[PDB]
Structures are given as C-alpha cells and as structure tokens.
Design an enzyme around this catalytic site. Structure first.
Site, PDB file in Angstrom:
ATOM      1  N   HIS A  55      13.336  23.533  54.062  1.00 28.85           N
ATOM      2  CA  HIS A  55      14.303  22.909  54.910  1.00 28.85           C
ATOM      3  C   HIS A  55      15.568  23.763  55.162  1.00 28.85           C
ATOM      4  O   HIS A  55      15.810  24.118  56.407  1.00 28.85           O
ATOM      5  CB  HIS A  55      14.879  21.454  54.714  1.00 28.85           C
ATOM      6  CG  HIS A  55      14.005  20.343  55.210  1.00 28.85           C
ATOM      7  ND1 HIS A  55      13.707  19.209  54.425  1.00 28.85           N
ATOM      8  CD2 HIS A  55      13.242  20.254  56.285  1.00 28.85           C
ATOM      9  CE1 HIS A  55      12.827  18.458  55.195  1.00 28.85           C
ATOM     10  NE2 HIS A  55      12.540  19.100  56.250  1.00 28.85           N
ATOM     11  N   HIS A  69       9.734  20.334  54.454  1.00 27.63           N
ATOM     12  CA  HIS A  69      10.354  20.310  53.132  1.00 27.63           C
ATOM     13  C   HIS A  69       9.646  21.207  52.141  1.00 27.63           C
ATOM     14  O   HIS A  69       8.373  21.353  52.170  1.00 27.63           O
ATOM     15  CB  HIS A  69      10.574  18.910  52.580  1.00 27.63           C
ATOM     16  CG  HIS A  69      11.244  18.723  51.269  1.00 27.63           C
ATOM     17  ND1 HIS A  69      12.619  18.582  51.035  1.00 27.63           N
ATOM     18  CD2 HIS A  69      10.634  18.632  50.081  1.00 27.63           C
ATOM     19  CE1 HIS A  69      12.766  18.376  49.725  1.00 27.63           C
ATOM     20  NE2 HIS A  69      11.617  18.388  49.147  1.00 27.63           N
ATOM     21  N   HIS A 114      19.945  18.055  46.974  1.00 26.51           N
ATOM     22  CA  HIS A 114      19.902  18.609  48.327  1.00 26.51           C
ATOM     23  C   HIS A 114      21.260  18.645  49.059  1.00 26.51           C
ATOM     24  O   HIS A 114      22.145  17.961  48.600  1.00 26.51           O
ATOM     25  CB  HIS A 114      18.919  17.922  49.305  1.00 26.51           C
ATOM     26  CG  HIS A 114      17.601  17.569  48.643  1.00 26.51           C
ATOM     27  ND1 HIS A 114      17.169  16.316  48.464  1.00 26.51           N
ATOM     28  CD2 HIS A 114      16.664  18.370  48.137  1.00 26.51           C
ATOM     29  CE1 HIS A 114      16.043  16.333  47.752  1.00 26.51           C
ATOM     30  NE2 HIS A 114      15.676  17.563  47.643  1.00 26.51           N
ATOM     31  N   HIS A 134      19.337  13.092  43.850  1.00 22.72           N
ATOM     32  CA  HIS A 134      18.366  11.994  44.062  1.00 22.72           C
ATOM     33  C   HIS A 134      17.964  11.454  42.696  1.00 22.72           C
ATOM     34  O   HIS A 134      18.067  12.096  41.661  1.00 22.72           O
ATOM     35  CB  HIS A 134      17.166  12.320  44.954  1.00 22.72           C
ATOM     36  CG  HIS A 134      17.603  12.659  46.350  1.00 22.72           C
ATOM     37  ND1 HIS A 134      18.446  13.764  46.526  1.00 22.72           N
ATOM     38  CD2 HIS A 134      17.392  12.173  47.592  1.00 22.72           C
ATOM     39  CE1 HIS A 134      18.713  13.883  47.825  1.00 22.72           C
ATOM     40  NE2 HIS A 134      18.036  13.030  48.483  1.00 22.72           N
ATOM     41  N   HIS A 175      18.215  15.993  55.231  1.00 26.21           N
ATOM     42  CA  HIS A 175      18.572  17.288  54.604  1.00 26.21           C
ATOM     43  C   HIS A 175      18.989  18.256  55.686  1.00 26.21           C
ATOM     44  O   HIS A 175      18.348  18.393  56.772  1.00 26.21           O
ATOM     45  CB  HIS A 175      17.376  17.846  53.819  1.00 26.21           C
ATOM     46  CG  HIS A 175      16.933  17.041  52.642  1.00 26.21           C
ATOM     47  ND1 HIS A 175      15.605  17.155  52.133  1.00 26.21           N
ATOM     48  CD2 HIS A 175      17.497  16.101  51.931  1.00 26.21           C
ATOM     49  CE1 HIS A 175      15.559  16.226  51.129  1.00 26.21           C
ATOM     50  NE2 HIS A 175      16.697  15.638  50.953  1.00 26.21           N
ATOM     51  N   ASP A 201      17.302  21.912  50.860  1.00 29.36           N
ATOM     52  CA  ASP A 201      16.426  21.868  49.697  1.00 29.36           C
ATOM     53  C   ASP A 201      16.869  22.775  48.553  1.00 29.36           C
ATOM     54  O   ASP A 201      16.593  23.992  48.621  1.00 29.36           O
ATOM     55  CB  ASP A 201      14.980  22.240  49.987  1.00 29.36           C
ATOM     56  CG  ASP A 201      14.258  21.563  51.067  1.00 29.36           C
ATOM     57  OD1 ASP A 201      14.766  20.602  51.718  1.00 29.36           O
ATOM     58  OD2 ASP A 201      13.072  21.831  51.328  1.00 29.36           O
ATOM     59  N   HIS A 224      22.648  17.720  52.452  1.00 24.94           N
ATOM     60  CA  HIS A 224      22.350  16.758  53.533  1.00 24.94           C
ATOM     61  C   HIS A 224      23.147  17.117  54.745  1.00 24.94           C
ATOM     62  O   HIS A 224      24.170  17.847  54.533  1.00 24.94           O
ATOM     63  CB  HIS A 224      22.572  15.335  52.971  1.00 24.94           C
ATOM     64  CG  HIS A 224      21.425  14.850  52.156  1.00 24.94           C
ATOM     65  ND1 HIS A 224      20.708  13.702  52.439  1.00 24.94           N
ATOM     66  CD2 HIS A 224      20.854  15.387  51.038  1.00 24.94           C
ATOM     67  CE1 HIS A 224      19.797  13.550  51.458  1.00 24.94           C
ATOM     68  NE2 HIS A 224      19.805  14.557  50.641  1.00 24.94           N
ATOM     69  N   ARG A 255      19.564   7.708  46.450  1.00 26.92           N
ATOM     70  CA  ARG A 255      20.821   8.495  46.476  1.00 26.92           C
ATOM     71  C   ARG A 255      21.791   8.089  45.425  1.00 26.92           C
ATOM     72  O   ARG A 255      22.711   7.212  45.596  1.00 26.92           O
ATOM     73  CB  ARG A 255      21.376   8.468  47.912  1.00 26.92           C
ATOM     74  CG  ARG A 255      20.354   8.936  48.934  1.00 26.92           C
ATOM     75  CD  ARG A 255      20.863   9.523  50.143  1.00 26.92           C
ATOM     76  NE  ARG A 255      20.056   9.567  51.253  1.00 26.92           N
ATOM     77  CZ  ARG A 255      19.934   9.860  52.486  1.00 26.92           C
ATOM     78  NH1 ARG A 255      21.008  10.350  53.176  1.00 26.92           N
ATOM     79  NH2 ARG A 255      18.754   9.889  53.079  1.00 26.92           N
TER      80      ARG A 255
HETATM   81 CU   LIG Z   1      17.971  14.761  49.612  1.00 26.24          CU
HETATM   82 ZN   LIG Z   2      14.246  18.767  52.453  1.00 20.09          ZN
END
Ligand SMILES: [Cu+2]
Ligand SMILES: [Zn+2]
Ligand SMILES: [Cu+2]
Ligand SMILES: [Cu+2]
Ligand SMILES: [Cu+2]
Ligand SMILES: [Zn+2]
Ligand SMILES: [Zn+2]
Ligand SMILES: [Zn+2]
Lengths: 154, 154, 154, 154
Positions: D80, D71, D46, D120, D63, D83, D48, D143
């Site tokens: 998002h 999401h 993602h 992730h 995000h 995403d 962020h 993370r």
């Molecule tokens: Cu993320």
């Molecule tokens: Zn998201």
C-alpha cells in the site's frame, strides 16, 4: 439566526440594479448582484461609508473602512473593508456576480445596514496602479449607481 | 456621541421628500421632514419595518413595532413604534414637520437604521376610528413615497 | 483545486472543540471555529508552531511566525502569522466564528498542515498592553485545548 | 535539511502511545514506536490517509495509498504505502519498534504531515490471508488508537 438585506441601485444614468446580501449566524455574507445599463467590461463595486443619497451617490462617501487600511482586492490583506473588486458586465450590459465576503456583516458594530453599495464606471486597480487615487479608490472613479442597504424579510 | 441619519423619499408619484433624523447620547430622536407634491391636508407618516423597496413601497412591510402593540399616535401608549402621527400639506403641497420621538432610536436593539419611512396618501386615524385597519394602518393607506434610512456623517 | 483540514481540540480540561480550514487555488483561508466548555467572554485563538502534543498543550511552541514579526491582531501589519485574534464565548460557554485569514495557507511553504490551533484561557491584548508578554503572547496565557491540523477530504 | 514529526496515539480505549518519525535529506524515515496497554501479541500499524479524528479513528479513512496498490507487508512490492506491518506488545502490554521505511516521506508529494498513524487491535495478515478484506486492511480491523502526524522541533 439568519439575516438578509437588499439594495436597489439607481442613478441618473441608465444603470439600474438590485443586490441581495445574506448572512448566517455571524459568519460570512453572500452578495448576489444584477445590474444592467453598464458598458461591457470590468467595473468597481464597493460598500461606501454613508447611506446619504441627498447629493446623488457623491455623499455615500469613502470606502467603508473600520480597520483603517489602504484600498485592495477582496482577496488581499491591506484592502479597505468595502472592497468587492470588479463585476464583469456582459456584452448587453447586464452584470451577474456572487461574492462571499467576511468583512461586510449584517450585525454588530461594523454592520453594513444603512450604508451604500456603489457600482463604478472604470475598472478598479485593486490598488495595483500607482495612480494617486489607487491607494484610496482603485481609480474606479465615476459613481454610476448606489443604494442604501435596508432590511428585507427572510 | 451624536448620530445622524437621512431618508430621501421617492415613490412612483410626483411626491419627493427628504428626512433627517438626529440622536444624541442614546436619547430622544429629532426628525426633520420636508415633502413636496402632496394633496393639501393631513397624510400618514410612519416608520415601516423593512427597507425592502424592491416592489416599490409595498415591500416596506407593516409599521415598525418591536413592542408588538396596536396602531396609534405618538402621544398614545398603545402605539406601534413606527407611528409618527400626521404631517399636513400647505396649499403649495408642502409639509415641513419637526417630530420628536423616543421610540425610533439610531443605536441598539430597535434601531431604525436600514428601515423605511413612508408618506401615506390619506389621513391617519390614530386608531381612533373603528374601521378594521385602524388597529394596523390608521386607514391612511396608499404609500405615495418612501426611503431607506441611511447613515449620514456627524 | 480545493483543500480542507480539521483540528479536533481537546485539553486536560472541559474545553472540547472542532475547527475546519478550507482554501481554494492559492488564496485565503476560511476557518470555521466551534468550541464549548469555555467561559463567557473573549479568549485568544492562535496557530502555534508545532503540532507536538506530547507534553500536553505546552509542547506546541509559540505562535507560527515565519515572517518574523511581533504579536498583534489579524488586522495588523506588524502581527505574527498565527495570531487569529479572539473568539467570543456565549452564556452557555460556546464560541462560533468564521475567520478569513491570508497568512495560514494549506499549500507550499508556510503551509500550516501538521501545526496546532490553540484556544487560550485569558483574552488576547492584541499586543496593545505593555506586560512583557504583550509582544509575544498578548498575555492570553493558559492553553485550554489544542489540536494538530490534519488533512480531510473535500 | 533534517526533520522530525511526532504523533501521540489515543483512542476511546486504555491504549496510549507516541510515535516520532525522522527524515534526512529526501531519503528514508525512521519511526520509533512506543504504546502501552495493548494486549500481548501482534497488532496492525498503518499510516491512514487523512488526519480527521472527528468521528474517532474511523474517519482517518483507508491506508495511505498514493501508488495505488494492494495491501502487503513493509517488505513487499505489491504494498500500500501506509502498511507498516505489525508491532509486537509484550506481556505487560508495551510495544517498542523502529521501522525504517522509504515510503512515508515528510517533504514533498506523498508527505505524511497531517495524516494519521493507527494501531489495529488484530494482527494484520500482510495480505497473505484470503479473508476478503486481506488485500485492503489485511484483516486487522479494530482502531484502538491513533493520532495526527504533527511537526516537532527538528
Ligand atoms: Cu490500518
Ligand atoms: Zn494497507
Ligand atoms: Cu467605491
Ligand atoms: Cu403606514
Ligand atoms: Cu497562543
Ligand atoms: Zn477601497
Ligand atoms: Zn401603526
Ligand atoms: Zn502572536
């Protein structure tokens, strides 16, 4: 470490004042200003070279200028070093301002201990005028009150 | 490399005064003192710690003492640092003194810039008495006038 | 409208660091720098064009120079854009400063978001020397740690 | 009016990586991903909100979500903006992807310069799951690695 200094502005006019300068580590300085006895409007407030006082305010000399530049606004790059803009005077003649400036330190070379702050009669041009005195004084011309920056406890 | 400073004395009395300090290389300093409106006789002439001046002369603090010692006379080893002896008023109420001290520089740590010089109402003991304030003030007490040591051209 | 960023410097060395940049409205930018792992004395501190980081610190390109100038000091008209002079390291190898520059915005064109802040090994010349790299680097040469300028809250 | 950006993923783990992103005119942007020493299988990928990185990856925030939505998967309306879905690491734990999205510009508002790309450790639900964080993180939390999107030579 943290440093502080004060400056009691007094002239031969009904202009009074006191200004406190605060500084942490060796970052920026905070200057709190309260002056009364001024005409409502924009003034001119600078850190003048010398601390004299023997010949009133007319001996605190020119603008504090270690970088050798032109006159400007606090938010300019060509500014003196001592340029602090204009403080607005309220309808009753009291002026309360707070300026945080990174060119007027309380420690090392360039320190502003034993120098003077001067409040000016006419509004400073910020060097924007094309006066002759613009590039040097802001034509803020007429030194109403000054005082030497001295050491105050903490 | 000569450095000069000034201090224009004024209290809430009719005691005026003006002092110049001079320093060469990074040596001894010469103080020239002239003060008017003083009762005939010896008084106190000290270099007090802070330039304060905001609650008159009673804000200048104690005497300047970097070495942390007891009060004394310039010609004494135990001496504070700010202790410049006594100055004597003529019969016209004037004291013209020329002091040469090595403990009040204008540069580096211990620099007396932004600090204050005070003229006491009574005579300086030199610590020779056994008063209680002898170790501290010379029982000279009562600040008749003071000044923020500011930088002056060279 | 206020905006902040942060640059977490890391190298292939023992120089760590973290710097933040704040800017309000569309005036100047306060940069608070704090590094450790460096060697007592002066370094070089510049805003390099790219954020890159792929081939370590060497992929950051030269100094940000939109206005196309020569290398200088922050207080130089002829200066680059990314020149931020020198940060001083104490005895424990730690440097802290507070730069107020007006050439590194966080908005519009010239924005320095996504660009890198580098600390160099040698001291910068201010383009005063006459090496060959004096007008380009300040012969500060040696990229000890860099970080890409990233957005942070407020 | 072409552009390029890179981000070089590094966490407090044996997870490396470098992503470049490319945009032409003011349209779509192609992202090339390559990361090493990720465990075989699906992850989360993602953009962020913040570039932070001072408290590792956990200060990169949520995000990137300008259009304020829930999401979802790249190919979803409810999405998002940050995403990018999941990338698949192989048995030797390398992952190479080429995601082409219309929601991470590099110019104007919504610009992801100075933001962070985070891989992730778990597989992202795509919002299908019903965990509780599904409509927020897609329940991929962990993370492993991240980096600030910085400019690179076009
Ligand atoms: Cu993320
Ligand atoms: Zn998201
Ligand atoms: Cu002025
Ligand atoms: Cu005394
Ligand atoms: Cu550099
Ligand atoms: Zn000026
Ligand atoms: Zn004493
Ligand atoms: Zn440069």
């Amino acid at each position: 470490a943290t440093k502080k200094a004060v400056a009691v502005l007094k002239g031969t006019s009904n202009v009074e004042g006191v200004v406190t300068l605060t500084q942490e580590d060796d970052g920026p300085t905070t200057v709190n200003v309260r002056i009364s006895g001024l005409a409502p409007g924009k003034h001119g407030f600078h850190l003048h070279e010398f601390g004299d006082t023997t010949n009133g305010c007319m001996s605190t000399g020119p603008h504090f200028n270690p970088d050798k530049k032109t006159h400007g606004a606090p938010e300019d790059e060509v500014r003196h070093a001592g340029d602090l803009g204009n403080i607005v005077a309220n309808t009753d003649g009291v002026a309360e301002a707070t300026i945080v400036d990174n060119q007027i330190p309380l420690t090392g070379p360039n320190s502003v201990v034993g120098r003077a702050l001067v409040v000016h009669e006419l509004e400073d041009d910020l060097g924007k005028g094309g006066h002759e005195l613009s590039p040097t004084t802001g034509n803020a011309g007429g030194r109403l009150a000054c005082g030497v920056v001295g050491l105050t406890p903490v």
